[PDB]
C-alpha cells in the first residue's frame, strides 16, 4: 500500500495517488492548442451526448479574461473550481499591478494551488489538466498544467484521451508561423487523427487570439467550413 495516500512515497520515489489523478484526465475528451503567426488557438472536441442537452451552454473552452483562455480535461467539477480560481487570480494581479504582464505567472499560481493538493494529507489532487493560451507582453503563450502542478510552455500540445495521437501527429506535421486558417485546418486534421476510424468528428469548439486583439470564439457555422 504505497498507493493509498497522497503523502506516501513509493520506494522508487513515486506518488501513485498523483499518477492516478492523472488517469482521470485521460477520460476527458481531447483538446489542443497551437501557436501560429502572431497568435494562438484552442480546439476542443466535445463528446456530444444527447439532443436533450443545451449545446450553446456547457462547453470546455473558457475565457479567463479577454486575452487569456483555458481548456480543461478530466473531472468536470474539479475543472470548474480551477477555472474560477484562474479567473479570480487573474483579477487579483490586475488590481495589484494594473495589468497581466506575463501569463506564465497566472499559470504558476494555478499550478501551485494544484501542487499543494499533492503534499498535505486530508485532500486529494485535482483530477484535471488545463491548457492556457493567450497574448501577453512577451507575446502569444501556450501552457499546459497537470494534476501534479507540472507546467510546460509549448508551440503546440494536447490534453485528454486522444493526447498521444494528437501529439505525435503534430510532432510530424506542425510548422511555426502558419496563417490562422492553415493552423485551424492542421488542428482539425490532428484531432481527426485521434478518432477510431469509422467515427466522424462533430462540431468542435475553436477560439483564437492574435496580437493586438481580444479573443474570438468561432461560431458553429464558421467551424463547419473546416469539417
Amino acid at each position: 500500500a504505497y498507493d493509498r495516500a497522497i503523502t506516501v512515497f513509493s520506494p522508487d520515489g513515486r506518488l501513485f495517488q498523483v499518477e492516478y489523478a492523472r488517469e482521470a484526465v485521460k477520460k476527458g475528451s481531447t483538446a489542443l492548442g497551437m501557436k501560429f503567426a502572431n497568435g494562438v488557438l484552442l480546439i476542443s472536441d466535445k463528446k456530444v451526448r444527447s439532443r436533450l442537452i443545451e449545446q450553446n451552454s456547457i462547453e470546455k473552452i473558457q475565457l479567463i479574461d479577454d486575452y487569456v483562455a483555458a481548456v480543461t480535461s478530466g473531472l468536470v467539477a474539479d475543472a470548474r473550481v480551477l477555472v474560477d480560481f484562474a479567473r479570480i487570480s487573474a483579477q487579483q494581479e490586475k488590481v495589484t499591478y494594473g495589468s497581466l504582464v506575463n501569463i506564465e505567472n497566472l499559470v504558476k499560481r494555478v499550478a501551485d494551488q494544484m501542487q499543494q493538493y499533492t503534499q498535505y494529507g486530508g485532500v486529494r489532487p485535482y483530477g484535471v489538466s488545463l491548457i492556457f493560451a493567450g497574448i501577453d507582453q512577451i507575446g502569444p503563450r501556450l501552457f499546459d498544467c497537470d494534476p501534479a502542478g507540472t507546467i510546460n510552455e509549448y508551440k503546440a500540445t494536447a490534453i485528454g484521451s486522444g493526447k498521444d495521437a494528437v501529439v505525435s501527429f503534430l510532432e510530424r506535421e506542425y510548422k511555426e508561423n502558419l496563417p490562422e486558417k492553415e493552423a485551424v485546418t492542421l488542428g482539425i486534421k490532428a484531432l481527426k487523427s485521434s478518432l477510431e476510424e469509422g467515427e466522424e468528428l462533430k462540431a468542435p469548439e475553436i477560439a483564437s487570439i492574435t496580437v493586438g486583439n481580444k479573443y474570438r470564439i468561432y461560431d458553429q457555422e464558421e467551424v463547419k467550413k473546416f469539417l
Partner: protein
C-alpha cells in the same frame, strides 16, 4: 480483428443460452431427478425384502443397472448444461484491474458454485481432491457398482467363499447403491435449486459486470 473475435464468442453464447438452461433446470430436470429418486427408493425396497443366495451372484440385477444408467444420463446432461452457463460467464470476465470489481466478484461467486456442482456434487473428476468426495455417488456410478459387485461375485462363485457375511455384503452392495442414488439425487436437487436462485438474482452483473458513467468527466 480482436474486437470481432471477442464479439463472435459472445454472440454464440449469449444470456439466452444460459437462461435456456436455467428454465430447463427449473422444469424438466428437477422432475427427472425426482423420478430417479423414486425409482431408486422402490428398488431399495425390493432388495431390503430379499434373502440372497449364491443364485444372486450369478446375475447382475437389471432393475439396479437401469436406475444407475438413468442417473448417469441425468448427471451427463447437467454437466453439459452447467458448462454452457460457465462459458456464458467466463467469456465476459472483463479486463483485469485492481478496482471496479464488484461485478467481477459476482461472476467469480457464481462460477464457484457451478464448479462445486460439476466437480464436487456431480463427482465428474478423474480423481477427487483432499476435500474428499462429499457426494454420496458420482457420475461414474455404474462403474463403481459393477467393480464393487464383481469382486464379491468372484469370491462367492470361484470353490466359492463360505463367508456368511460376504453373501449379505453382496446384498448390501445392491441396497447401498440404491440408497446412494436416493441421497445423491436429494443433494443434487438442493444444488440445482441453489444455482437457479443464484443465477436469476445475479444475471445482470454476470453479463455486464461494469458500467462506468463519465457524466463526471468532460
Amino acid at each position: 480483428k480482436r474486437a470481432a473475435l471477442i464479439q463472435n464468442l459472445r454472440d454464440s453464447y449469449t444470456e439466452t443460452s444460459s437462461f435456456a438452461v436455467i428454465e430447463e433446470w427449473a422444469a424438466g430436470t428437477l422432475q427427472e431427478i425426482e423420478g430417479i429418486a423414486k425409482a431408486a427408493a422402490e428398488a431399495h425396497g425390493v432388495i431390503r425384502n430379499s434373502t440372497y443366495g449364491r443364485a444372486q451372484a450369478e446375475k447382475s440385477p437389471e432393475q439396479l443397472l437401469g436406475v444407475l444408467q438413468r442417473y448417469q444420463d441425468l448427471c451427463h446432461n447437467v454437466y453439459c448444461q452447467a458448462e454452457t452457463i460457465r462459458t456464458v460467464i467466463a467469456i465476459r470476465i472483463p479486463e483485469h484491474k485492481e478496482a471496479d470489481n464488484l461485478g467481477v466478484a459476482v461472476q467469480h461467486a457464481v462460477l464457484k458454485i457451478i464448479d462445486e456442482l460439476e466437480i464436487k456434487t456431480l463427482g465428474s473428476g478423474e480423481k477427487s481432491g483432499s476435500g474428499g468426495a462429499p457426494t454420496p455417488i458420482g457420475m461414474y456410478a455404474l462403474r463403481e457398482y459393477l467393480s464393487a459387485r464383481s469382486t464379491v461375485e468372484d469370491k462367492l462363485l470361484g470353490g466359492g467363499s463360505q463367508s456368511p457375511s460376504l453373501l449379505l455384503e453382496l446384498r448390501q452392495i445392491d441396497a447401498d447403491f440404491m440408497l446412494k442414488v436416493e441421497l445423491a439425487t436429494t443433494h443434487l436437487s438442493t444444488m440445482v435449486r441453489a444455482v437457479i436462485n443464484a443465477y436469476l438474482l445475479n444475471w445482470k452483473k454476470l453479463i455486464q459486470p461494469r458500467t462506468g458513467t463519465d457524466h463526471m468527466y468532460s
